[PDB]
Amino acid sequence: AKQQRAEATERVTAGLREVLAARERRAQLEAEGLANLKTLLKVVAVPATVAKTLDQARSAEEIADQVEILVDQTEKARELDVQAVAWLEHAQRTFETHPLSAASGDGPGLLTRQGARLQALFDT
Amino acid sequence: GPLGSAKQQRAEATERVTAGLREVLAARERRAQLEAEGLANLKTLLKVVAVPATVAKTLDQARSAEEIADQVEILVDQTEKARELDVQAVAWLEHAQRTFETHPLSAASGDGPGLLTRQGARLQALFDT
Amino acid sequence: GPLGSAKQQRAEATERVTAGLREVLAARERRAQLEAEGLANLKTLLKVVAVPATVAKTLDQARSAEEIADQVEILVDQTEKARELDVQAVAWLEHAQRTFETHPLSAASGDGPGLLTRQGARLQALFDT
Amino acid sequence: AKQQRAEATERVTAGLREVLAARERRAQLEAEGLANLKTLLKVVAVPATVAKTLDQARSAEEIADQVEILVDQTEKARELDVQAVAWLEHAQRTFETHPLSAASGDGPGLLTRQGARLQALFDT
Structure with missing residues (x-):
């Protein structure tokens, strides 16, 4: 026993x-x-945002959190882009007609020199 | 008089x-x-x-339409550089998802789904557009 | 910027x-x-x-020292013309007194003094100066 | 009787x-x-004052009154004269020193052209 x-x-x-x-x-x-x-x-190649923090990550979970953060930042960048383009086509239109900036007999509009790259943004 | 009217x-x-x-x-x-x-x-x-915060904080102080035009050139540049970061961020996120699905520390095991399983939703969103 | 600082x-x-x-x-x-x-x-x-009334009523409105100077030339002229009237007035008053002393309608009679007797006072005053 | x-x-x-x-x-x-x-x-010669009224006089008494009037007028003229000269020598002195009128390098004083007849009045 x-x-x-x-x-x-x-x-x-x-x-x-x-x-x-x-x-x-x-x-x-x-x-x-x-x-x-x-x-x-x-x-x-790792986005600068997360790179400097990715190495310090102490578990896979922390890396995933860091991914989420990046996804969040990337969504917000795209809707700033949505605003930015909305305002720029508005700003362009405004500049075309306003007496302080419009294409006169005295030379083209203030935004004509940037007319090229603006249309790039609008279409894509 | 003579003096006064002269x-x-x-x-x-x-x-x-x-x-x-x-x-x-x-x-x-x-x-x-x-x-x-x-x-x-x-x-x-x-x-x-609505004016982008970038441009807004400086727009009211602008001393001419020219300064405003310059402030636009800036916004355009910032927005171009944001757009090519978007390309980098998506390339890497596509890689990270792929990595996570297969790695033993994160893969959907018998113990529950993959760590990025809950974010598959927001991820596929980013990818198509 | 390029546009703005130019x-x-x-x-x-x-x-x-x-x-x-x-x-x-x-x-x-x-x-x-x-x-x-x-x-x-x-x-x-x-x-x-104190400003002569002649000059006073116009002095304040004067639009230059020249107009005031003209207003002086005037006063001087008026004062010259007043002074030669003084000569006429005294010559005649001297004659009138002389006339009155002897004329039957005015002479000191038995009925009281001459009509200009009471003014002999103010008259001799005018005459000496 | x-x-x-x-x-x-x-x-x-x-x-x-x-x-x-x-x-x-x-x-x-x-x-x-x-x-x-x-x-x-x-x-x-009769002072203009009284001449036009002397003829209308209806008694010697009225003529005497008209004389008194003339004597009164003549006294008052002499004391205006006393004022007028007092002010003119004051006005002359003022003009000699004041910047709007004084003899500068730009020509004589405004009252220099009248300096002649002024001294006439002062002495007599």
Whole structure:
């Protein structure tokens, strides 16, 4: 009867030893995995935004969060773009007719020199 | 009298000259004030459509339509540079998604979906347009 | 910017010119205003001694020292003409007194003194000076 | 007794007749005297003031009144003269020093041309 109680106290201690050991090993490997994830992600050029923060990321989760941030920034850039173009075609039209800027006998409109690159923005 | 009416003819001559300058000067001061009014209204007209914060913080202070035109050239450049960053950001995000689907630290395992699974929605949005 | 700072150099040039006229005009307007102040004080100075009614009613309205000078020439002439009337008036009054002393309608009779007897006082006054 | 009463009623009527007659005669002569007084007065030139009124005078008394008036006017003229000279020497002095009128490098004072006749007035 006593034999089974001694054997049990030991199966627990060995169990802890095995659990602690398996954890320390999984940790070290996951670290390697995180290091290599970062390497893999860098194969294609990394936006400056996240690059300087990507390396400091302490888990894959932090990298994913950093991705979300970039996606958010990228959405907001596109709607500024939507405003910016809306205002620029408005600003162009305004400049074409206004006496302080319009194409007179005294030379072209103030925005004629920029007429080229403006039409680029509008179509695309 | 002899003295007094002669003196009066000199005064009228002095005034006709002073009046002459006054007239020229006033034409200038008026052309100025009207151009100023023109600039004020130019700004009002431009603001009818919402002004990008970039341009707004400097637009009201503009001392001529030329300065406003320069402020436009700037916005155009910023917007071009934003648009080529958009290309970089999407190329990398397309790569990151691909990377995440397959990597053991992030892949959809038996333990729940991939880490970027919840963002697949917003991602495919960016990709098509 | 390229457009805006060039425009600024033209504005400063326009203003330097406008400022130039403004400066010339102001020098004139100031020389005028000071001469005006001079005239006002000329009048004040002249009134320190009582001004003959002749000259007074016109002195304040005077548009220059010249008009005041003319108004003086006048007073001098009036005063000369008053002084030669004084000679006529006294010659005749001397004659009238002499006439009255002897004429039966006026002479000191037994009925009381001559008619100009009561005025002999004021008469001899006029005569000596 | 009755003789003296009749004679008395008549001495009164004749008395009135004589009184009325002596008065009408004294009147006519005094008139002649007034006419000739006027003539005598005119031997020496008559001031314009009184001349136009001297002829209309209806008695010697009115002529004397007209004399008084002339004497009054003549006194007042002399004291205006006293003022006028007082102010003119003051006005001269003022003009000599004041910048709007003074003898400059640009020609003499405004009252220099009148300097001559002014000194006439001051001395006499």
